[PDB]
Write a protein that holds these residues in place. Structure first.
Motif, mmCIF file in Angstrom:
data_model
loop_
_atom_site.group_PDB
_atom_site.id
_atom_site.type_symbol
_atom_site.label_atom_id
_atom_site.label_comp_id
_atom_site.label_asym_id
_atom_site.label_seq_id
_atom_site.Cartn_x
_atom_site.Cartn_y
_atom_site.Cartn_z
ATOM 1 N N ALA A 1 0.800 -1.213 0.000
ATOM 2 C CA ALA A 1 0.000 0.000 0.000
ATOM 3 C C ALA A 1 0.836 1.267 0.000
ATOM 4 N N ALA A 2 2.085 1.199 0.463
ATOM 5 C CA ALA A 2 2.978 2.345 0.370
ATOM 6 C C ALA A 2 3.415 2.615 -1.062
ATOM 7 N N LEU A 3 3.398 1.595 -1.924
ATOM 8 C CA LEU A 3 3.807 1.792 -3.311
ATOM 9 C C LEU A 3 2.749 2.550 -4.099
ATOM 10 N N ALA A 4 1.478 2.304 -3.806
ATOM 11 C CA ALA A 4 0.410 2.945 -4.553
ATOM 12 C C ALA A 4 0.313 4.422 -4.178
ATOM 13 N N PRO A 5 0.007 5.297 -5.134
ATOM 14 C CA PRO A 5 -0.190 6.711 -4.800
ATOM 15 C C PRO A 5 -1.363 6.887 -3.849
ATOM 16 N N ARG A 6 -1.222 7.836 -2.933
ATOM 17 C CA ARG A 6 -2.242 8.068 -1.925
ATOM 18 C C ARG A 6 -3.255 9.102 -2.406
ATOM 19 N N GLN A 7 -4.377 9.163 -1.697
ATOM 20 C CA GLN A 7 -5.454 10.115 -1.939
ATOM 21 C C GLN A 7 -5.866 10.724 -0.597
ATOM 22 N N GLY A 8 -4.866 11.196 0.140
ATOM 23 C CA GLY A 8 -5.068 11.613 1.510
ATOM 24 C C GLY A 8 -4.482 10.601 2.471
ATOM 25 N N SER A 9 -5.342 9.802 3.100
ATOM 26 C CA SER A 9 -4.901 8.723 3.968
ATOM 27 C C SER A 9 -5.193 7.340 3.404
ATOM 28 N N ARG A 10 -5.999 7.240 2.349
ATOM 29 C CA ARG A 10 -6.373 5.960 1.769
ATOM 30 C C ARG A 10 -5.629 5.752 0.460
ATOM 31 N N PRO A 11 -4.727 4.778 0.373
ATOM 32 C CA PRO A 11 -4.026 4.534 -0.891
ATOM 33 C C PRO A 11 -4.984 4.069 -1.975
ATOM 34 N N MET A 12 -4.686 4.473 -3.211
ATOM 35 C CA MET A 12 -5.542 4.162 -4.355
ATOM 36 C C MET A 12 -5.065 2.863 -4.996
ATOM 37 N N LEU A 13 -5.537 1.753 -4.440
ATOM 38 C CA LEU A 13 -5.271 0.441 -5.007
ATOM 39 C C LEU A 13 -6.302 0.109 -6.079
ATOM 40 N N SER A 14 -5.940 -0.831 -6.944
ATOM 41 C CA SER A 14 -6.867 -1.325 -7.945
ATOM 42 C C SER A 14 -7.820 -2.346 -7.332
ATOM 43 N N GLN A 15 -8.877 -2.657 -8.074
ATOM 44 C CA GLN A 15 -9.757 -3.745 -7.681
ATOM 45 C C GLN A 15 -9.027 -5.076 -7.816
ATOM 46 N N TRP A 16 -9.416 -6.037 -6.974
ATOM 47 C CA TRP A 16 -8.714 -7.316 -6.941
ATOM 48 C C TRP A 16 -8.805 -8.034 -8.282
ATOM 49 N N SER A 17 -9.981 -8.026 -8.900
ATOM 50 C CA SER A 17 -10.162 -8.624 -10.221
ATOM 51 C C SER A 17 -9.837 -7.628 -11.330
ATOM 52 N N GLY A 18 -8.651 -7.030 -11.253
ATOM 53 C CA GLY A 18 -8.221 -6.073 -12.250
ATOM 54 C C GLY A 18 -7.030 -6.565 -13.041
ATOM 55 N N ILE A 19 -6.203 -7.401 -12.413
ATOM 56 C CA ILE A 19 -5.066 -7.985 -13.109
ATOM 57 C C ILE A 19 -5.566 -8.936 -14.189
ATOM 58 N N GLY A 20 -4.763 -9.102 -15.227
ATOM 59 C CA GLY A 20 -5.151 -9.945 -16.342
ATOM 60 C C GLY A 20 -5.878 -9.168 -17.419
ATOM 61 N N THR A 21 -5.759 -9.660 -18.648
ATOM 62 C CA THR A 21 -6.418 -9.035 -19.782
ATOM 63 C C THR A 21 -6.745 -10.106 -20.807
ATOM 64 N N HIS A 22 -7.683 -9.779 -21.692
ATOM 65 C CA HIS A 22 -8.028 -10.677 -22.788
ATOM 66 C C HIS A 22 -8.601 -9.834 -23.922
ATOM 67 N N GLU A 23 -7.797 -9.617 -24.958
ATOM 68 C CA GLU A 23 -8.260 -9.019 -26.201
ATOM 69 C C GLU A 23 -7.972 -9.997 -27.334
ATOM 70 N N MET A 24 -9.032 -10.450 -28.005
ATOM 71 C CA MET A 24 -8.911 -11.467 -29.042
ATOM 72 C C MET A 24 -10.153 -11.539 -29.921
ATOM 73 N N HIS A 25 -9.989 -11.289 -31.218
ATOM 74 C CA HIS A 25 -11.009 -11.517 -32.236
ATOM 75 C C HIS A 25 -10.333 -11.587 -33.592
ATOM 76 N N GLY A 26 -11.026 -12.199 -34.545
ATOM 77 C CA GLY A 26 -10.550 -12.242 -35.911
ATOM 78 C C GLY A 26 -11.241 -11.210 -36.775
ATOM 79 N N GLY A 27 -11.852 -10.212 -36.143
ATOM 80 C CA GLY A 27 -12.569 -9.179 -36.867
ATOM 81 C C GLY A 27 -12.576 -7.836 -36.162
#
Lengths: 110, 51, 38, 50, 33, 51, 20, 28
Positions: free
Chosen positions: E7-33
């Protein structure tokens, strides 16, 4: 004798018992931490933080000093400050802002 | 042309209405209004001269 | 911060304990810029 | 004392009824998770569900 | 809580660090069109 | 020794300080410097020769 | 700090130089 | 008014809420 043993911070562990001041003073070391980039990062610095804790029905203060400070000197200074606070808990402090000087010329004579 | 005077390219760029930015960050990134530098004890409690 | 942290449990207008502790810490020659946080 | 074996997981998703599945990731919480050595002799701490 | 997570690595917004949502890691972009 | 002897925190050995101002009568050449001693490092004035 | 910096492994303080 | 939610438009039987107070927009 010895009323509160709570350890509000889990990251810091006690190293000495709650010695009494003839308040009580407890010295807590810090557990292991994450990696540091380099060894010259923990004791590097001189600023000291005096954290305030919520009143527990007694007040708790978290005072953190840099490593190089002598533990005996820190303990003695904290004990003297605690004794002074216990004795004093005035007009002298009030004199050093919200009493004024020129306004303190109507009341003394009129 | 099949027959032609020789050449030597000239390059340039025009950046209008743009303020150049040199942020006071250690990695040049913008990770907050109060930057990484400007909080370090090197630049906080001391006095420095800028040339 | 520092490896060692000291804790005082005082039995307990204008606050005075925090300024008293800050002055006591500032009295230490090797420590400067005492910070008070609540 | 050797660490007790951990059960392997196999979930279901769609028609697929036997997909191999690793244990789900959870942020460490002292109330739920605790650090226990895999082997008591040498310290290799890891999170367990108590 | 800043000792049990990054939490020290993430930029803060006062006293609450701005972490991402838990289901944010990972990606999927795929189509043939 | 392999610890608590050197910093390895990207600090310089030699420093070139240029004067903040200089005044020169035709008998004396006065230079004014302000040297900033890091935040943690210390130096002995056996160094700091005028060039 | 740990008992000051280590020494190279294998009057100390003060000077009294005067006279002229 | 003690129940400040009574001042908001009601989506169904509940007020339309959300967000965030304050602005941090400053650069250049």
């Amino acid at each position: 004798v010895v009323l509160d043993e709570s350890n509000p911070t889990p990251s810091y562990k006690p190293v000495t018992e709650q010695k009494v001041i003839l308040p009580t003073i407890q010295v807590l070391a810090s557990k292991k931490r994450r990696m540091a980039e380099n060894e010259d990062d923990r004791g590097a610095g001189s600023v000291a933080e005096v954290q305030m804790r919520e009143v527990k029905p007694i007040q708790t203060v978290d005072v953190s000093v840099p490593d190089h400070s002598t533990p005996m000197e820190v303990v003695q200074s904290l004990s003297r400050a605690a004794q002074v606070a216990q004795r004093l808990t005035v007009e002298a402090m009030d004199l050093s802002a919200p009493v004024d000087a020129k306004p303190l010329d109507l009341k003394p004579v009129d | 042309d099949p027959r032609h005077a020789l050449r030597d390219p000239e390059r340039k760029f025009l950046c209008d209405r743009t303020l150049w930015r040199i942020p006071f960050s250690s990695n040049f990134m913008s990770m907050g209004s109060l930057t990484d530098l400007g909080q370090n004890l090197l630049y906080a409690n001391a006095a420095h001269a800028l040339d | 911060r520092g490896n060692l942290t000291y804790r005082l449990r005082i039995p307990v207008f204008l606050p005075l304990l925090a300024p008293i502790i800050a002055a006591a810490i500032g009295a230490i020659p090797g420590i400067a810029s005492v910070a008070i946080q609540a | 004392e050797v660490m007790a074996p951990q059960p392997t997981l196999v979930a279901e998703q769609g028609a697929m009824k036997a997909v191999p599945v690793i244990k789900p990731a959870q942020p460490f919480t002292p109330a739920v998770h605790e650090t226990q050595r895999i082997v008591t002799n040498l310290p290799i701490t890891t999170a367990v569900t108590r | 809580m800043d000792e049990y997570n990054y939490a020290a690595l993430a930029p803060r917004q006062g006293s609450r660090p701005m972490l991402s949502q838990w289901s944010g890691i990972g990606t999927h972009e795929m189509h043939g069109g | 020794p392999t610890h608590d002897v050197t910093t390895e925190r990207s600090q310089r050995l030699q420093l070139r300080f240029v004067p903040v101002d200089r005044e020169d009568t035709q008998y004396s050449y006065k230079t004014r410097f302000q040297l900033a001693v890091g935040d943690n490092r210390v130096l002995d004035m056996a160094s700091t020769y005028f060039d």
